[PDB]
DNA sequence: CCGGAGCGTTCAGCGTTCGTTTATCTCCCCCTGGCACTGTCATCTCCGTCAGACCGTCGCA
């Protein structure tokens, strides 16, 4: 419940306004939003749990850590 | 051997006390009316439906 990101609410995308494209798993969700767990009721994909290693920008974008690779 | 006294019950004279009303006196509620320097145009809505149809509407042809 602490980690849930809720796409609904005031000033947000409502359930009647939801479509297939916004519910589905995007390739950019890797490390930023869990593709597995989400409420399986009427709001599939809209509410989703943050990833384990996810961090949040000051702006509000979700980061994820990667090890730098130099010269192989 | 009835006669009287005492006792049981049951009623007519006036004498007081109730049952139910009435207008007057405080406290409160409720509605209409007064305010006189000037003061003369608000308000945020609404977006990441949605899916296509039904329909009238409307300017171009």
Question: What are the phi and psi torsion angles at A48 (to 5°)?
Answer: -145, 150
CA A23 to CA A5: how far, in whole Å? 13
- Experimental technique for the deposited model: cryo-EM
* A12 Cβ within 7 A of any nucleic strand B atom: yes
Closest CA to A46 of A17, A67, A70: A17
Resolution in A: 3.3
Handedness of CA A70, A55, A60, A31 (dihedral sign): positive
* A11 Cβ within 7 A of any nucleic strand B atom: no
Nucleotides of B under 7 A from a protein CB: 47-51
Please give the radius of gyration of chain A, using alpha carbons only, rounded to the nearest integer: 14
| Residues ≥6 apart with Cβ < 8 Å to A22 | A7, A13, A45, A46
């Amino acid at each position: 419940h602490k980690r849930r990101l809720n796409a609904l609410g005031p000033g947000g995308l409502s359930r009647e306004r939801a479509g297939f494209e916004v519910r589905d798993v995007h390739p950019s969700h890797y490390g930023r939003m869990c593709p597995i767990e989400t409420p399986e009721g009427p709001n599939i994909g809209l509410i989703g749990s943050l990833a384990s290693y996810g961090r949040i920008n000051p702006f509000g974008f979700i980061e994820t850590p990667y090890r730098k690779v130099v010269e192989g």
